[PDB]
């Protein structure tokens with residue numbers, strides 16, 4: 638698969654055996670997911686962002702499926718307006734900028 | 737070039753006869769750059785962000801050479817931690833997300 642950028646790169650994902658939609662965001666260090674609940678334990682933390690900050694719940698070692706490809710990694714859960722897939726998981730699935 | 741993502745896709749650009757580093761950000765609709773001066777007229781605008789909106793100046797028909805590639809379009813100036821290069825301009829340099 639190869640994705641142009643004329644629309645928003647909205648890809649579908651599966652976490653917790655649930656179907657979600659997410660943004661393929663290369664300017665995100667971390668993966669930040671909407672309000673949802675997850676197994677395992679977690680540290681609170683502030684994430685940066687354009688103007689101001691938000692509290693993310695940090696879940697390590699989450700199994701996530703981005704678009705057909707399995708990846709394991711840290712996942713941040715908080716008051717975000719969209720599910721954001723950052724570099725940390727984008728690498729895992731061999732995603733790469735190409736012009 | 738092919739940019740894998742183990743590190744921030746920070747690249748080099750040229751605007752108003754300046755060289756600046758900027759992030760290649762596929763989860764950004766527009767291009768927003770740090771406080772600088774540019775030709776012509778601007779509208780006020782707000783931008784969403786993760787943790788709230790910031791006031792920006794909107795400029796049109798602005799020329800950016802991104803990574804050796806020439807492009808034109810709407811650029812936003814304001815209080816951002818980094819020059820973000822968005823889709824509005826990435827499409828132009830033929831940029832595509834690959835895996």
Ligand SMILES: COC(=O)N[C@H](C(=O)N[C@H](Cc1ccc(-c2ccccn2)cc1)C[C@H](O)[C@H](Cc1ccccc1)NC(=O)[C@@H](n1ccn(Cc2cccc(C(C)(C)O)n2)c1=O)C(C)(C)C)C(C)(C)C
Nearest residue numbers: 664665666667685686687718763764765766783784785817
């Ligand atoms: C290191 O900091 C870091 O990794 N922070 C990240 C971050 O904020 N990344 C950069 C920014 C960044 C990067 C690096 C640093 C940095 C780097 C080094 C040192 C210090 N700072 C700081 C900020 C911006 C990011 O790509 C966001 C993601 C996003 C996308 C959509 C909605 C909310 C958030 N993009 C934007 O904020 C851009 N933006 C905002 C709204 N939109 C349109 C849109 C799309 C989809 C849905 C909607 C809704 C539902 C809201 O209607 N709107 C859009 O495109 C914008 C930038 C143009 C405003 C994450 C928090 C995402 C991880």
